[PDB]
Amino acid sequence: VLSEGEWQLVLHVWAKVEADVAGHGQDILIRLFKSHPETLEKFDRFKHLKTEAEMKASEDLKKVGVTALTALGAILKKKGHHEAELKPLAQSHATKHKIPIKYLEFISEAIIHVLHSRHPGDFGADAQGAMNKALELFRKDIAAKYKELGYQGG
Ligand code: HEM
């Protein structure tokens, strides 16, 4: 799917994320919630967080962000050979929480935005394209695992 060069650009910027998984996770979630507020409804433990400062102060939100970016990091490092990592995540998202593919599109946008905000010198056009392809492949494979479980992802 992705070229070896595209994967290298993906994993190069991901190494920058790993310098501060918590801070990236916070900014991505807060960007997702501000750009698409309906996504905040999937997090009942976050309903009382009304301001950006309250979200940044919530260790719970921070930990949830770290858990997400950790799983995505492990998937990206498989360079497309991620069935074993993607199936449990698809099941969690399709049976417990029911997350539509469109919401995975929303957070992908927030991921790209935060990465370019923090690392423009390591996230120009070729790298953005590479990361977009990797996230597209993630969403496409999650969608197929969704259907396999009987959840159509809408
Ligand atoms: C790249 C995108 C995402 C990744 C990698 C991801 C990953 C994860 C992981 C690893 C868990 C923990 C599951 C477990 O231990 O069984 C989780 C939980 C969850 N995810 Fe996602 N997720 C993503 C996107 C989203 C989006 C966009 C939403 C909602 C808008 C969402 C909602 C949830 C919820 C509600 C939970 C359960 C956490 C809790 O309620 O305490 N996720 N996610």
Curated annotation (Swiss-Prot):
Note the superkingdom of the native organism.
Eukaryota
- Residues where Phosphoserine is found: 3
Q: Does the keyword Metal-binding apply?
A: yes
* Positions bound to heme b: 93
Write out the residues that bind O2: 64
Its localization reads:
Cytoplasm, Sarcoplasm
Chain residues that bind nitrite: 64
User: GO MF annotations for this entry?
Assistant: heme binding; metal ion binding; nitrite reductase activity; oxygen binding; oxygen carrier activity; peroxidase activity
* Chemical reaction(s) catalysed: Fe(III)-heme b-[protein] + nitric oxide + H2O = Fe(II)-heme b-[protein] + nitrite + 2 H(+); H2O2 + AH2 = A + 2 H2O
UniProt keyword list:
Cytoplasm, Heme, Iron, Metal-binding, Muscle protein, Oxidoreductase, Oxygen transport, Phosphoprotein, Transport
SUPFAM superfamilies in the record: Globin-like
**Which Cys-Cys disulfides exist here?**
none
Q: Which residues are in the Globin domain?
A: 1-147
Task: Give the enzyme's EC designation.
Answer: 1.7.-.-, 1.11.1.-
Please give the residue positions where the record annotates the modification Phosphothreonine: 67
Major localisation:
cytoplasm
Record-level GO cellular component terms: extracellular exosome; sarcoplasm
Query: Pfam families under this entry?
Result: Globin
Name one process (GO BP) from the record: removal of superoxide radicals
Assembly information from the UniProt record: Monomeric.
Its annotated function is as follows:
Monomeric heme protein which primary function is to store oxygen and facilitate its diffusion within muscle tissues. Reversibly binds oxygen through a pentacoordinated heme iron and enables its timely and efficient release as needed during periods of heightened demand. Depending on the oxidative conditions of tissues and cells, and in addition to its ability to bind oxygen, it also has a nitrite reductase activity whereby it regulates the production of bioactive nitric oxide.
Give the protein family.
Belongs to the globin family.
Tell me the protein's name: Myoglobin
User: Gene name, please?
Assistant: MB
